[PDB]
Design a protein around this ligand. Sequence first.
Ligand code: GVG
Lengths: 20, 337
Amino acid sequence: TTYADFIASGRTGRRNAIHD
Amino acid sequence: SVKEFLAKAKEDFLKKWENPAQNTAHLDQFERIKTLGTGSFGRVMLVKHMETGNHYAMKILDKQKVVKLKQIEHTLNEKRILQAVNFPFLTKLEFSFKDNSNLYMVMEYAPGGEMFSHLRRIGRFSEPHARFYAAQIVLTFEYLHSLDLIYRDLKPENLMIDQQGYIKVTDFGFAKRVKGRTWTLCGTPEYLAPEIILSKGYNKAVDWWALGVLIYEMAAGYPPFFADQPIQIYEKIVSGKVRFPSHFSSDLKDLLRNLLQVDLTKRFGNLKNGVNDIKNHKWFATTDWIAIYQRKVEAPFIPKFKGPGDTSNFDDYEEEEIRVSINEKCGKEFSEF
Ligand SMILES: Cc1n[nH]cc1-c1ccccc1
């Protein structure tokens, strides 16, 4: 499931801003 | 009238914009209590203002680190905008100052914690719960965009819950006053409009795209474009495909199709009738816009009050000295701060 793939991903914690 | 309210808000903003408040407090007027969050060039701490006993959230930026990250102009943007602005659903800047080493921005403390923490724990919000928050964002962008400000970092991590269960948008480190278009590559991968990843000049439409990402994430429990690495997220964002959960309502899907529209001539918020296309969409039919602004609507979630200075709705972070050099750093770079 999509939920399961999200929870298993590396990006369920706080996400940092990017910059050039 | 909305037009009438905006007109007078812009009058209020302009005076402060053109003559910014500066040096309105000092570090030792505050008791430092605890770190509420961390970032690249700075942190945010719960502090107590001794003279009044008020609790605040103080953003601390190391000037040397701001400089290394090429965020001087952006930091000056943040402070100059936040001191000028005034709106219920934004963390109000109460004081700012600087010393030899750091910059400081003192804002109201929202003890409910980040939407992020609650969204992750609970899994997802119901549509009414999501719509309540979304409306507060719709209004905040309406206010900001009318002042020619783009926000450029919408995400749950930046939406604090107050004691009444209402939202305060915080962190304006990428907010900018631009008439016309701008080009900076900034924001958070999951929330970036296609324009941005494709290095086009872009405008405030990117904030409405970001609203579509947030509404989706709130209602789904996960974002519309995710992968383990940012490049994979960007490939999905520019693909022109989006998949909704079966539990999403017809109205929801259609709002999100018009928000998460790659085509700018068709993206809601960026059309001839602007924000009303969003405000008059069926998904918002139940929304009393004025009662939300007035905080008359009952919050679907009211955070646990355990007193003033309670931080139990925030995570724990490693505490780190506030060291103040005997020598002034980066005086010129931050002279107007
Ligand atoms: C400014 C603020 N007010 N209340 C809470 C706040 C924050 C902001 C960033 C990170 C953590 C906590």
